[PDB]
A paper describes a structure:
The selected template antibody was AAL160, an anti-IL1β antibody that was isolated from immunized mice. AAL160 is a well-characterized antibody with good physicochemical attributes. AAL160 binds IL-1β with high specificity and affinity, yet its VH sequence is 99% identical to germline IGHV5-51*0,1 with only one Gly54 to Ser difference, and its KV sequence is 100% identical to germline IGKV3-11*0131. The AAL160 template might represent a middle ground between mature and germline antibody: on one hand it is functional and specific, but on the other hand, some of its CDRs are almost identical to the germline sequence. As such, it may retain some germline properties. The structures of AAL160 and h142 were aligned to identify key residue positions that contribute to IL-17A binding in h142 and are not expected to disrupt the structural integrity upon mutation in AAL160. In order to identify potential epitopes in IL-17A that can be targeted using AAL160 as a template for engineering, we screened the structures of AAL160 and approximately 2500 redundant antibody X-ray structures by docking them into IL-17A using the HexRF method. Notably, both predictions are based on the original sequence and structure of AAL160 that does not bind IL-17A at all, without taking into account mutations that will enable binding to IL-17A.
Author numbering:
A (entry chain H): 1 to 132, 137 to 218
B (entry chain L): 1 to 214
The structure:
Amino acid sequence: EVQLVQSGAEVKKPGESLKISCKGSGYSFTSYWIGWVRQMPGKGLEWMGIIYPSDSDTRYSPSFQGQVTISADKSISTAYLQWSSLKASDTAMYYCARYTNWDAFDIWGQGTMVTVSSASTKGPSVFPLAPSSGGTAALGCLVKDYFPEPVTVSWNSGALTSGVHTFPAVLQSSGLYSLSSVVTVPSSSLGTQTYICNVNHKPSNTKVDKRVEP
Amino acid sequence: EIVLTQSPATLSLSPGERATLSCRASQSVSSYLAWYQQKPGQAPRLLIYDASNRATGIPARFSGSGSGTDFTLTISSLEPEDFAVYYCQQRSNWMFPFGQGTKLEIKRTVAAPSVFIFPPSDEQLKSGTASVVCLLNNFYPREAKVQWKVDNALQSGNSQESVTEQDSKDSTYSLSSTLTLSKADYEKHKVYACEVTHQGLSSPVTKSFNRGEC
């Protein structure tokens, strides 16, 4: 099977150096160009550069020239992408892809997520979105100021799943993430039913169960 | 130096329907044009190479055509796995521009959002920050304008939105808009209002509260 396998997710601070890898398998790595493509959160694909592993002939896009270094070790079928000084704007998914004489990227790596932020690891602060016409009420938890991703949220230990929406996290200007998880319930159940959001943040070993009362 | 313009930005159709996607190059070049598909949460993959050839393992329902500067991708009858983002790419000497992408999304009937507003919690206020959350639940199409008004004055630069991906069961979107203020600015004002404009509502709908009321 022809494949490109990339190195794991990285979490860094601005100024730090970083080198990520792309390992080819099931084919003669030396014989095909390898391209690097960036995908910023919520954005499209941008070509960064390309390298021919045989002689390390490298070409960069003008937007990336002098900002990153693309290199390859053909002896171990591996291409690399490196930064000497990461920027917060380098936060993106990075893909490596095999280029062919059909002028196309026929095989792609699975992607390497790179998150760059001045923030250090930090558990979230969890606040209620308290329920206050109609037979439906909305309630939730605001999971604020944590880093890095991800957090998981369940309601009543997984017993409440219908009507739950947990929003994608948004990176705030502070470099910390925030999201809300909400649920719509019958307004008549507010006096009777207990609602608890279970929030887990594995990078900080934080777990919070927040009771949301009207 | 060429630009690839994809249209439409969002193509809304149902499984069983025929899809036609467009890619127009600003200049005509001799390199081969390719189409890529990126399913939610996955790496891109090659679909079509040299404008009309299906890549390995790509089903017969995908076809491509065009020449000069006008290219088209067609899916004869959509399957649920085809709802994804599609990008075109064509090399310009040593530069490799991609189109901005077309999102192929599930069309369903128009559904107005249910709108809820949540004041900041007293626990958050004690920490010096106030987050006011506005929830737009289960609406279609995705396009929605959310405007914050504090004492009937329009706000700008102090809010962030997050939108869910299209629900796998009912094909609607949900959206959160969070207004962030310092505790001192929050307590200087009285009326907090979230105004929603959406195709499913005959007029914009506002949800509001007067600070410090039960």
